């Protein structure tokens, strides 16, 4: 378990450094389905989070030993997954809000009008589902890593290497959740099932991106185009 403890700490640190927790942030607040002012802020903040997700990925042990082609394949396939999980860990239930990394705090109607559109209730439902899991940074980070380092994405050159980079992450999460939450013994398969729930939402989100492109005034920001 010293190699496991090192892995958990590395991943916890990588998530923490690239994603402040809800309690650390100073919140601030601000006819047609897409409010272009909210869309502008939302797409800018998402761009910055994609950059932070890349910085998180590079700190995951082994990730940079994959070929560049596969690093890019993995990041593109997990982009919406990780963005959606991240914003869903910034949910305040008593105000029904989500808080972005600059502190911008939007309620459900505003999230709807920023771009989630018909996917708003689905995404807010998923955030509500995460709350009873009481995930800490190590757990959110490991779930993010497990979701990113997935050997079944299309067009991977070395999928077996990706699976073998993922298996230490799964074992770390299994061990960690046992030593943290012995009264919560089905918690590991419960959190892995959220990844599967998350893939379903992100598949619908990829559909929504096509409609958004037809609706926004100009172009998607360049990095978002690359990722999506």
């Amino acid at each position: 378990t010293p190699e496991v403890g090192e892995l958990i700490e590395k991943v916890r640190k990588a998530h923490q450094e690239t994603f402040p927790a809800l309690c650390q942030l100073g919140k601030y607040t601000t006819r047609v389905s897409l409010d272009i002012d909210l869309w502008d802020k939302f797409s800018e903040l998402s761009t910055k989070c994609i950059i932070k997700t890349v910085e998180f990925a590079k700190q995951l042990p082994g990730f940079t030993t994959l070929t560049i082609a596969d690093q890019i394949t993995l990041l593109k396939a997990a982009c919406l997954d990780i963005l959606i999980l991240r914003i869903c860990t910034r949910y305040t239930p008593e105000q029904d809000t989500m808080t972005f990394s600059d502190g911008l705090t939007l309620n459900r109607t505003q999230m709807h009008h920023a771009g989630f559109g018909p996917l708003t209730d689905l995404v807010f439902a998923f955030a509500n589902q995460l709350l009873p899991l009481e995930m800490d940074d190590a757990e959110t980070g490991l779930l993010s890593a497990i979701c990113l380092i997935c050997g079944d994405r299309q067009d991977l050159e070395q999928p077996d290497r990706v699976d073998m980079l993922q298996e230490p992450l799964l074992e770390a999460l299994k061990v960690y959740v046992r030593k943290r939450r012995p009264s919560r013994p089905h918690m590991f398969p419960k959190m892995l099932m959220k990844i599967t729930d998350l893939r379903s939402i992100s598949a619908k989100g990829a559909e929504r991106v096509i409609t958004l492109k037809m609706e926004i005034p100009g172009s998607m920001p360049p990095l978002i185009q690359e990722m999506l």
């Binding site: 890349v54 590079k58 890019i72 690359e226």
Partner: peptide
């Protein structure tokens, strides 16, 4: 994927 290469290297 120009920006993404830069970010990774």
């Amino acid at each position: 994927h120009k920006i993404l290469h830069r970010l990774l290297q």
